[PDB]
């Protein structure tokens, strides 16, 4: 039962506890966080969505910041760490205006009015990339710089090439409607980082029933069944229990008569590849060797249904429903062995610009694999954004300093009470490059006040902050490029979370 200004200061002090914890984790030089899991595992990461998923705060203000990051992992992807820092300094600057006696509705509407000036300033200083032609060589170099922050910096060029082709497959460039849902990620322990492959289809980690099978399938004939071409075994467990010698010897009679009839069923139907849930017998794979019939063994439960959607076939539960209509289509079915490691994956490629890609990431350590899955999904939204909008903005804090100059200049043209909200929006927008200077091991104010002087005095285009300790400023030459939609929603969702907090003035439990 808290009301008044003492309840409002309880919300800002609770929200700044989330912001100041993640203020040090901004940028590539950000301090990583240790997380103690519930089962006793200890991992370390610098990803911003991973910190808020493990931060279990019982305060209701901190749970709204957790609710904020439920949607920005899919929308912007890159600005997860900075949006919490931008929302915290906005309430910190609102705390300065709270002692003056200002109602939060004028601040929430004043932050909304100042946000539209920063949105109007973002597209004016933007730059176009992909006009009038399609290309893949400059699109690689933009994704090659962003993925250098994690521990896959030694193999950051290989992930930049495959992520460009993966986004361009499931979507058309002229349609500018890209779906990230059709691109799935996977991984397993073992191998190296250079063995990450890209398939124009869906790849299953399942091997053949016989190593003497042919390594390529040129026919578009795939049979998807539940029981294998043998005496049929159930889907859960066999649990065999013989009765006597007459039961076991009659089983030998039943084994041989189905070894010739079930393989006869695949020829009158017209299929070539036999994908089934359970494996095949040791005597059954001899007849498949003569008549050129491949087969895949020991496929799991949900691994069957993901094959039939990409191949366009249907599930055949019994042998009586086997027809030519229930077959899937494919371009070339092969198997890839990753060097000396006997992996033998089921590689189902359509040999056409199709609507299904799955990138299979490898690695010699398990800590690198889950950190590369989020880094590839971070790179998935980046190339998705360039097709929908080729307009980009200069990153490295150059967009936030240039937007803060137009907001403070347009604050003098407002003869209302909301001018103090616009001037506080100018200093709060610059906290994202200011935390870039403190995390880089320099002075946070001396680096900030010299770049804003550089953007006014000698040159009108914006300059960035050399957080990687490079030669000088102007990160356009350093190839630090962020998207426009990732920046226009960075200042939007940070402002809208302040309006949801400033409208809350009472928590009752």
């Amino acid at each position: 039962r808290l009301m008044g200004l003492e309840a409002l200061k309880s919300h800002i002090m609770a929200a700044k506890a989330v912001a100041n914890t993640m203020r040090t984790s901004l940028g590539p030089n950000g301090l990583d966080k240790m997380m103690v899991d519930k089962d006793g595992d200890v991992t370390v990461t610098n990803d911003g969505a991973t910190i808020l998923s493990m931060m279990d705060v019982d305060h209701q203000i901190a749970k709204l910041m957790v609710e904020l990051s439920k949607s920005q992992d899919d929308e912007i992807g890159d600005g997860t760490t900075g949006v919490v820092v931008l929302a915290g300094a906005l309430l910190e600057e609102a705390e300065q205006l709270l002692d003056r006696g200002i109602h939060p509705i004028r601040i929430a509407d004043g932050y909304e009015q100042a946000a539209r000036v920063a949105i109007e300033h973002l597209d004016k200083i933007s730059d176009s990339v992909l006009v009038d032609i399609k290309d893949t060589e400059p699109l690689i170099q933009t994704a090659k710089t962003t993925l250098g922050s994690k521990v896959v910096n030694s193999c950051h060029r290989q992930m930049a090439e495959i992520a460009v082709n993966a986004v361009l497959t499931v979507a058309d460039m002229e349609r500018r409607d890209v779906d990230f849902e059709l691109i799935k990620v996977e991984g397993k322990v073992g191998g190296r980082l250079e063995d990450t492959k890209l398939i124009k289809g869906v790849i299953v980690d399942k091997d053949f029933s016989h190593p003497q099978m042919p390594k390529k399938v040129e026919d578009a004939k795939i049979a998807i069944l539940t029981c294998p071409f043998e005496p049929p075994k159930p889907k859960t467990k066999h649990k065999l229990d013989v009765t006597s010698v007459e039961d076991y010897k009659a089983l030998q009679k039943y084994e041989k008569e189905k070894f010739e009839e079930m393989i006869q069923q695949i020829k009158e139907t017209g299929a070539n590849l036999a994908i089934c849930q359970w494996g095949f017998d040791d005597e059954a794979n001899h007849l498949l060797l003569q008549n050129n019939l491949p087969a895949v063994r020991w496929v799991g439960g949900p691994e069957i249904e993901l094959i039939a959607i990409a191949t366009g076939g249907r599930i055949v539960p019994r042998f009586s429903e086997l027809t030519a209509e229930k077959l899937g289509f494919a371009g070339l079915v092969q198997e890839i062995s990753f060097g000396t490691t006997k992996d033998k994956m089921l590689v189902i490629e359509q040999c056409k610009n199709s609507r299904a890609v799955t990138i299979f990431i490898r690695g010699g350590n398990k800590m690198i694999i889950e950190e590369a899955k989020r880094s590839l999904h971070d790179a998935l939204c980046v190339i998705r954004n360039l097709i929908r909008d080729n307009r980009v903005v200069y990153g490295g804090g150059a967009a936030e300093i240039s937007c803060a100059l137009a907001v403070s200049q347009e604050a003098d043209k407002c003869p209302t009470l909301e001018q103090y909200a616009m001037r506080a929006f100018a200093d709060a927008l610059e906290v994202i490059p200011m935390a870039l200077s403190e995390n880089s091991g320099m002075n946070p104010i001396q680096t900030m006040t010299e770049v804003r002087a550089r953007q006014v005095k000698e040159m009108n285009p914006a300059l960035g902050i050399d957080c990687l300790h490079k030669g000088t400023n102007d990160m356009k030459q350093q190839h630090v490029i962020e998207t426009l939609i990732g920046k226009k929603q960075q200042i939007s969702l940070a402002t809208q979370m302040v309006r949801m907090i400033l409208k809350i003035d009472d928590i009752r439990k």
Binding site: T416, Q419, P444, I445
Partner: protein, 516 residues
């Protein structure tokens, strides 16, 4: 960081001790501001809203908080007005460095940046001011009634205003000289009469009496000042007066006569006709026998002179004080045409001395009045009118009032912050926000909203000029130039220079130690 040693906590102790001085005096700003009540140790309660009295009655003991006390004392001698407004400027300045010191900025970088804001802040107040002339008598007359109308005495603001302008024109040559001394304009007040019965004496007027010298009128007066006590022979050491008979008792009375007459005969050789004796309490400055020896030589008797009155005499007639009778020369004498005692019905028994004819220009303003409360506020209205003329001589410029240069200073320094580099960009940003307290105080003291008034006034200054401000008479934002509220430039331009050197001195203080 570890931060084991803490020298910045004494800086935060120096800031918060000086912040309580300005915050307690903040609501007393403006004509419609709230008054302050004080209680003395004996139980006296005196209601007074003047800022120079409350800082004298606060009696602070902290060394950092004492720096705002002599800051108000230096404003009364340099400008003579603008007193509390320097403290609220210096108090809001140390509030702005509280946000700067938490950021990790060293105070010596703020000291060189606040001087750069002071050098730029003077340049904004120069071109926005209105230049006027000192030889024009209409400008000095009209601008003095407008400042005296907001004071306590406003019904006599049309009478004391031409008396203050005509006093400085006999002393200062208009539009040629720059130095103006207010000590050469003595204000003599006595009981009886009204304020309309006033006289501008070009010489000097004393409040004492020539008793018991029966001359009371001398021509060709050579005025001389003697600090030695012309009295009986007195020895501070052990002495004895031997007695022998009754004729010996008349001899020591003749010895007291002959010793004083030997000193009187030394005065007559140099041609001195008027003797001035300093006020002395520890011993008799003048005996009964020395009063009669100057009556025979037709020498006027003048005693009971304050030390401040001696300064008014030497700049008037050119008389130098002597310490003893053996150092009495003819070069230390003044010049006077006539000295007499004029006892009017309301002016009282005063010594009117005319005809100076000496290098030096002093004037005297004799103000009459019935009650004691009449003449004291008449002198405070004169000293408030004497300061606005002294402020116009050193700076031949005028500006609007009601905090209107303070809003223009907050807007031009914000535009100056976008063109600077380094640490100096944020210090002039905090210098601009610290100047907005003075219109926010005048917005709160006039009954308006403190935030909605200064925000509308900033947009009026971006499109217009310094004419927009706070009018306390009508209670709202209006044209200060059309409201005829005009203040001199030296009130504000010295309020910035004196407050900046105090903030630079306070931030440069690191540790406080006690010696013995």
């Amino acid at each position: 960081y570890q931060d084991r040693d803490k020298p910045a906590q004494i800086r935060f102790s120096n800031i918060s001790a000086a912040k309580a001085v300005a915050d307690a005096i903040r609501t007393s700003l403006g004509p419609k501001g709230m008054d302050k009540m004080i209680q003395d140790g004996k139980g006296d309660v005196t209601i007074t809203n003047d800022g120079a009295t409350i800082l004298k009655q606060m009696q602070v003991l902290h060394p950092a908080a004492r720096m705002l006390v002599e800051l108000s004392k230096a404003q009364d001698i340099e400008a003579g007005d603008g007193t509390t407004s320097v403290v609220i400027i210096a108090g809001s300045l140390l509030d702005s460095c509280t946000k700067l010191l938490q950021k990790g900025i060293h105070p010596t970088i703020i000291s060189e940046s606040f001087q750069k804001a002071l050098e730029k802040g003077i340049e904004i107040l120069t071109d926005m001011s209105r230049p006027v002339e000192l030889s024009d008598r209409e400008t000095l007359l009209n601008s003095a009634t407008t400042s005296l109308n907001s004071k306590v005495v406003s019904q006599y603001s049309s009478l004391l205003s031409p008396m203050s302008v005509n006093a400085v024109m006999k002393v200062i040559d208009p539009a040629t000289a720059t130095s103006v001394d207010l000590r050469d304009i003595k204000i003599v007040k006595k009981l009886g009469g009204t304020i309309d019965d006033c006289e501008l004496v070009e010489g000097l007027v004393l409040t004492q009496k020539v008793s018991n010298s029966g001359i009371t009128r001398v021509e060709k007066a050579k005025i001389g000042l003697i600090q030695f006590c012309l009295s009986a022979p007195k020895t501070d050491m052990d002495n004895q007066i031997v007695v022998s008979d009754y004729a010996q008792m008349d001899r020591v009375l003749r010895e007291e006569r002959a010793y004083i007459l030997n000193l009187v005969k030394q005065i007559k050789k140099t041609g001195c006709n008027v003797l001035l004796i300093q006020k002395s309490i520890l011993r008799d400055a003048l005996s009964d026998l020395a009063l009669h020896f100057l009556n025979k030589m037709k020498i006027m008797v003048i005693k009971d002179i304050e030390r401040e009155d001696i300064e008014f005499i030497c700049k008037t007639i050119g008389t130098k004080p002597v310490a003893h009778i053996d150092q009495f020369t003819a070069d230390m004498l003044g010049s006077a045409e006539l000295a007499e005692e004029v006892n009017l019905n309301g002016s009282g028994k005063l010594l009117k001395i005319t005809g100076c004819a000496s290098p030096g220009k002093t004037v005297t303003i004799v103000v009459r009045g019935s009650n004691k409360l009449v003449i004291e506020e008449a002198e405070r209205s004169i000293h408030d009118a004497l300061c606005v003329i002294r402020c116009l001589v050193k700076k031949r410029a005028l500006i609007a009032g009601g905090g209107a240069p303070e809003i223009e200073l907050a807007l031009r320094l914000t535009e100056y912050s976008r063109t600077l580099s380094g640490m100096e960009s944020y210090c002039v940003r905090a210098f601009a926000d610290a100047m907005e307290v003075i219109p926010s105080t005048l917005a709160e003291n006039a009954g308006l909203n403190p935030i909605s008034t200064v925000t509308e006034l900033r947009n009026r200054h971006a499109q217009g000029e310094k004419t927009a401000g706070i009018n306390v008479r009508k209670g709202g934002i209006s044209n200060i130039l059309e409201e005829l509220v005009v203040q001199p430039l030296l009130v504000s331009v010295s309020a910035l220079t004196l407050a900046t050197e105090t903030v630079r001195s306070i931030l440069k203080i690191d540790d406080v130690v006690n010696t013995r």
